[PDB]
């Protein structure tokens, strides 16, 4: 693979939101992972809509602000035949009705690929796809105060996750390789939103033990 990756670079990546204090990572993952896709097949990014995700997504195994996971969120776009523009259906950090309109679906996805459970795996997924979505063992205080370098906690698990979250790219310090994690607990959280999360150290926190991306 390439030594270093950052889909940024390429257009592929919407800014960062912010989920509020509602339990809709999973969505925000999946709405990262898709619209990378869609872009890598139409050259147009699009904000898609977290509230779809969660208010419609129940019967793909979705709790909306309780919880999800990013492959029921792909399941439920296959399912339902499309998932409308973030534009068209705003985020409200709270589960409500569906409100899903097919007039304003601006993307689609025809299942979804689980990535094998090591990290080699994961970087020749993030070489060669685009973005992809992860679940890491964020529940340290040492994740929720980081600031900035390279994320890395003793006790962090591979085996329990508990935060959705999407890998757009990895490199190394010039000064130690990462992976580069967007969030989304808004901009003022870690380096402008963004976490870089040791890599090649024993799939730390579990990064590429849950990852997966929609196929379009
Ligand atoms: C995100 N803000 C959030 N908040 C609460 C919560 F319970 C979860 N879950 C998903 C994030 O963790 C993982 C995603 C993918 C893989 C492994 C972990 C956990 C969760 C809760 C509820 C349900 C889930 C998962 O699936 C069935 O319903 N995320």
Partial sequence: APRSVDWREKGYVTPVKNQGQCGSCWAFSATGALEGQMFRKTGRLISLSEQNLV???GPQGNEGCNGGLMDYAFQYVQDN??????????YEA???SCKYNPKYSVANDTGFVDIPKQEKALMKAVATVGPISVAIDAGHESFLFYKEGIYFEPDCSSEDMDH???????????????WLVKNSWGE??????????????????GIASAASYPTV
């Fill in 164 to 178: 959705g979250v999407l890998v757009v790219g990895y490199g190394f310090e010039s000064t130690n390789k990462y």
């Fill in 55 to 57: 208010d419609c997504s």
């Fill in 188 to 205: 003022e959280w870690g380096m402008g939103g963004y976490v870089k999360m040791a890599k090649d150290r024993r799939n730390h926190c």
């Fill in 81 to 90: 035949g499309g998932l409308d523009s973030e534009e068209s259906y705003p």
């Fill in 94 to 96: 709270t589960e409500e």
